[PDB]
Design a protein around this motif. Sequence first.
Motif, PDB file in Angstrom:
ATOM      1  N   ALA A  52       0.849  -1.228   0.000  1.00 55.61           N
ATOM      2  CA  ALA A  52       0.000   0.000   0.000  1.00 55.61           C
ATOM      3  C   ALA A  52       0.877   1.268   0.000  1.00 55.61           C
ATOM      4  N   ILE A  53       1.904   1.218   0.831  1.00 58.10           N
ATOM      5  CA  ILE A  53       2.876   2.311   0.883  1.00 58.10           C
ATOM      6  C   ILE A  53       3.599   2.520  -0.451  1.00 58.10           C
ATOM      7  N   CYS A  54       4.025   1.435  -1.110  1.00 56.93           N
ATOM      8  CA  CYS A  54       4.665   1.551  -2.411  1.00 56.93           C
ATOM      9  C   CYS A  54       3.669   2.155  -3.391  1.00 56.93           C
ATOM     10  N   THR A  55       2.430   1.655  -3.336  1.00 56.35           N
ATOM     11  CA  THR A  55       1.433   2.137  -4.308  1.00 56.35           C
ATOM     12  C   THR A  55       1.232   3.648  -4.168  1.00 56.35           C
ATOM     13  N   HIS A  56       1.172   4.116  -2.931  1.00 52.64           N
ATOM     14  CA  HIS A  56       0.811   5.505  -2.645  1.00 52.64           C
ATOM     15  C   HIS A  56       2.012   6.373  -3.075  1.00 52.64           C
ATOM     16  N   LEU A  57       3.210   5.879  -2.790  1.00 53.14           N
ATOM     17  CA  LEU A  57       4.416   6.621  -3.244  1.00 53.14           C
ATOM     18  C   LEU A  57       4.366   6.768  -4.760  1.00 53.14           C
ATOM     19  N   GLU A  58       4.084   5.669  -5.452  1.00 55.14           N
ATOM     20  CA  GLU A  58       4.109   5.702  -6.908  1.00 55.14           C
ATOM     21  C   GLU A  58       3.061   6.671  -7.472  1.00 55.14           C
ATOM     22  N   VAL A  59       1.882   6.679  -6.878  1.00 54.25           N
ATOM     23  CA  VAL A  59       0.854   7.631  -7.340  1.00 54.25           C
ATOM     24  C   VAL A  59       1.288   9.082  -7.091  1.00 54.25           C
ATOM     25  N   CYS A  60       1.844   9.372  -5.914  1.00 51.60           N
ATOM     26  CA  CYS A  60       2.431  10.703  -5.697  1.00 51.60           C
ATOM     27  C   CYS A  60       3.445  11.099  -6.790  1.00 51.60           C
ATOM     28  N   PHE A  61       4.342  10.173  -7.153  1.00 50.61           N
ATOM     29  CA  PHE A  61       5.342  10.498  -8.194  1.00 50.61           C
ATOM     30  C   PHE A  61       4.705  10.697  -9.551  1.00 50.61           C
ATOM     31  N   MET A  62       3.725   9.858  -9.899  1.00 49.21           N
ATOM     32  CA  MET A  62       3.040  10.005 -11.186  1.00 49.21           C
ATOM     33  C   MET A  62       2.271  11.331 -11.245  1.00 49.21           C
ATOM     34  N   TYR A  63       1.639  11.692 -10.134  1.00 47.03           N
ATOM     35  CA  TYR A  63       0.874  12.948 -10.058  1.00 47.03           C
ATOM     36  C   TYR A  63       1.814  14.130 -10.317  1.00 47.03           C
ATOM     37  N   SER A  64       2.973  14.099  -9.656  1.00 48.82           N
ATOM     38  CA  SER A  64       3.943  15.189  -9.840  1.00 48.82           C
ATOM     39  C   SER A  64       4.481  15.159 -11.268  1.00 48.82           C
ATOM     40  N   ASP A  65       4.769  13.974 -11.777  1.00 47.06           N
ATOM     41  CA  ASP A  65       5.372  13.896 -13.134  1.00 47.06           C
ATOM     42  C   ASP A  65       4.414  14.256 -14.266  1.00 47.06           C
ATOM     43  N   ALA A  66       3.122  14.338 -13.951  1.00 52.84           N
ATOM     44  CA  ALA A  66       2.133  14.698 -14.947  1.00 52.84           C
ATOM     45  C   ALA A  66       2.344  16.139 -15.362  1.00 52.84           C
ATOM     46  N   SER A  67       3.013  16.932 -14.522  1.00 50.55           N
ATOM     47  CA  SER A  67       3.269  18.326 -14.867  1.00 50.55           C
ATOM     48  C   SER A  67       4.611  18.727 -14.266  1.00 50.55           C
TER      49      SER A  67
END
Length: 181
Positions: free
Chosen positions: A42-57
């Motif tokens: 769950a922690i890995c998943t949440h980290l990855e979504v944070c990074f994808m969100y930031s990398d979107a812009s």
Amino acid sequence: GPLGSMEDFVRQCFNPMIVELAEKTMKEYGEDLKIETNKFAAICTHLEVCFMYSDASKHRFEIIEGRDRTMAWTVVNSICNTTGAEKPKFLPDLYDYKENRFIEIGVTRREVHIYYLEKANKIKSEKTHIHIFSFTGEEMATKADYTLDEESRARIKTRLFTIRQEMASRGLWDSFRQSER
Ligand SMILES: [Mn+2]
Ligand SMILES: [Mn+2]
């Protein structure tokens, strides 16, 4: 059929640097990934979504999640001093330099609106923006303001779908879904 182990799954399906940050977070919390392994995923998943969100812009967001706790507050405090933003009471996940607000990102296997309401009730700030994703494509965000465009959010949802599918193929999905408190 074969039931794999969640640790094998996490180490095989997340980027090694996400895995390493999740290990550090867990150590920071006095949690043992070998025993709380659904939580590790769950922690890995949440980290990855944070990074994808930031990398979107690129350059729009400062990343707060992933940092050591002390450094995270150092960055939150610098942003507040520089931008005049109000200091949050709990560490958020990002700061959005376009909309001028911190963001709490949530990822859930529970119903998104209930999880959104719980998150909002917890941080109790009128300023931190919250954006929740679920594993089945639903989302909910503060004031129905989704921040990123449809294609950016779709990329995140597709990644979550892919994690769910790969878990289920290894027999891991049911326990992972049901373990969230
Ligand atoms: Mn966080
Ligand atoms: Mn979060």
